[PDB]
Amino acid sequence: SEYQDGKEFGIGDLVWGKIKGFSWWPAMVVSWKATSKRQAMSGMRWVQWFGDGKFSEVSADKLVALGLFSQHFNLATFNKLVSYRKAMYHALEKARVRAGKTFPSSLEDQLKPMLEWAHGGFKPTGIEGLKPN
Amino acid sequence: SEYQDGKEFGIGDLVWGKIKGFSWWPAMVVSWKATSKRQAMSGMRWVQWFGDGKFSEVSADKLVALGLFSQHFNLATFNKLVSYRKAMYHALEKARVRAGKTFPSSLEDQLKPMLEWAHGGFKPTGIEGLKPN
Ligand SMILES: C[C@H](O)CN(CCO)C[C@H](C)O
Ligand SMILES: C[C@H](O)CN(CCO)C[C@H](C)O
Questions:
Q1: What highest taxon heads this organism's lineage (chains A, B)?
Q2: Number of domains observed in the structure of chain A
Q3: Do B14 and B52 reside in the same domain of the chain?
Q4: How far apart are CA B20 and CA A76, in angstroms?
C-alpha cells in the first residue's frame, strides 16, 4: 500500500514539517492522489500545509507529530507572521475536532484558548486525541 | 533479507537504470514491499524513478551507482526533456541531503550548483556520502 516503508506517519496525521528556510510549520499527511502530482519517493510523505493549502513532498525525518507542540511551536514566528497565526488556527481547529475538545466564545481571541490547550499538552485527551478517524 | 543474491545494490542506493528506449535515468533501489506489486525475481531489483515516482523491476546487472555521474548523465536528453530535468533535480536533492551538502538559494537555477557539484565528484564527501543511512 501507500507509505509502507518502515518510516513514521500515515495519511491524516497532524504533523510539523520543516522546509529549508522556514520555521516548523503545521501540516497534514495526505495521499499522493490528493496532490495531482506523483507517488512520493520511498521514505517521503506528501503533506498539505495548513494556512495555504499547498502540497510538498517531505522526508519522514523532517516531520514530527503536531502533538509535540511546545517543542516546535515558534513563538517569534507567531508574533512576526500573520500567515503563521492563520496556520495555527486551522491546524488547532482540526486538532480540536478530532480530540472532542470544546472552547467558549475574532482571530487572536479565538486562537488564545486553543493555543493554551495545545501548549499545555492537549488535555484531557493528550496527544492521543489528535489521531485520524 | 531480500536482494541477498550476491549481486550489487541494496535498499536505498541511488542508481542509474536503463530501460530500452531510454537514456540512463536516476532512481532509488526500494524494497518490493514499497511497490504494491510482486516480490522481485532472482538477480532483480525494484527501483523507483526520480521524477515520476513510478516503479520498475530491473536486473542488478543493468544498474550503475549514481556516483558514476558524468559518464551516465545525458546532456542531450537533459536539454531536450523537462521530465529529465525534474528527475535530475529530485535525484540530486536526495543526494544533497544524504551528503550534508548545502547550496545558496527557480528550477534550472537551483539545478546549476547541484549539477556542478555532481559532475565534479560530489566534493567534499565523494560518492561515499550518497550511501543510505
Ligand atoms: C507561507 C509559508 O511559506 C507556507 N509554506 C508553504 C509553502 O508552500 C510552509 C513552509 C514553506 O513550510
Ligand atoms: C520517461 C519517464 O518520465 C521516466 N521513466 C520512468 C517511467 O517508468 C524512466 C525511463 C522509462 O527509464
A1: Eukaryota
A2: 2
A3: yes
A4: 54
For A85, B49, B61, the CA distances from B57, given in Å and listed in that order, are: 46, 11, 12
DSSP label of B35: T
Q: Resolution of this PDB entry, in A? A: 2.3
What's CA A36's distance to the chain center, in Å? 21
Name every chain B residue with its beta carbon within 8 A of the beta carbon of A31: none
Chain B residues near residue A5 by CB distance under 8 angstroms: 30-31, 33-34
Q: Containing domain of residue A86, as a range?
A: 67-131
Q: What is the enclosing helix (H) or strand (E) of A55?
A: strand A55-59
- Half-sphere exposure (CA, 13 Å, Cβ side) for B46? 19
| Structure-determination technique | X-ray
C-alpha dist (Å) from residue B6 to A106, B38, B40, B45? 65, 21, 14, 12
